[PDB]
């Protein structure tokens, strides 16, 4: 198992524009495209991602392409931030992987803004952080997702996703 596979399995691959949790504009294997409520506006992001005109449709290969960018800009995210690299540090090789599937889903300042979790796992406080983790709007949106995600930090293993 690998960060690749493992955020194939939490976003799927959807081939035509859809409305993710919160209701935005998303395509691919989990690319959010606008937070603006207008069609036409995702369907204009679109085109500029792709370079072609596209009609609100994409190819796997597309998705594909979109996907190696935002995992990259994940990584790189993270280790630019001076909140996130020293807990990205200090963490084991499945754990790194978790925090990775954060930033990908919400974004570096989104995750930078854990602050209390965050500093607990950083002090390796497993159990602490996983509480704490479960009371964020992010856990009570997207509740079966945030419990792999929680469950990889909890534990250090592979398990919740075999
Ligand atoms: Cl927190
Ligand atoms: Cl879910």
Do not use: C
């Amino acid at each position: 198992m690998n960060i690749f596979e493992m955020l194939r399995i939490d976003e799927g691959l959807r081939l035509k524009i859809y409305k993710d949790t919160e209701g935005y504009y998303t395509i691919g294997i989990g690319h959010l495209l606008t937070k603006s409520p207008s069609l036409a506006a995702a369907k204009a992001a679109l085109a500029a991602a792709i370079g072609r005109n596209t009609n609100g449709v994409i190819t796997k290969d597309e998705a594909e392409k979109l996907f190696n960018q935002d995992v990259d800009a994940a990584v790189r995210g993270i280790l630019r931030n001076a909140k996130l690299k020293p807990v990205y540090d200090s963490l084991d090789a499945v754990r790194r992987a978790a925090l990775i599937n954060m930033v990908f889903q919400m974004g570096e300042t989104g995750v930078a803004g854990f602050t209390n979790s965050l500093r607990m796992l950083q002090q390796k406080r497993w159990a602490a952080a996983a509480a704490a983790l479960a009371k964020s709007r992010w856990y009570n949106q997207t509740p079966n997702r945030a419990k792999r995600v929680i469950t990889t930090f909890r534990t250090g293993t592979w398990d919740a996703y075999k």
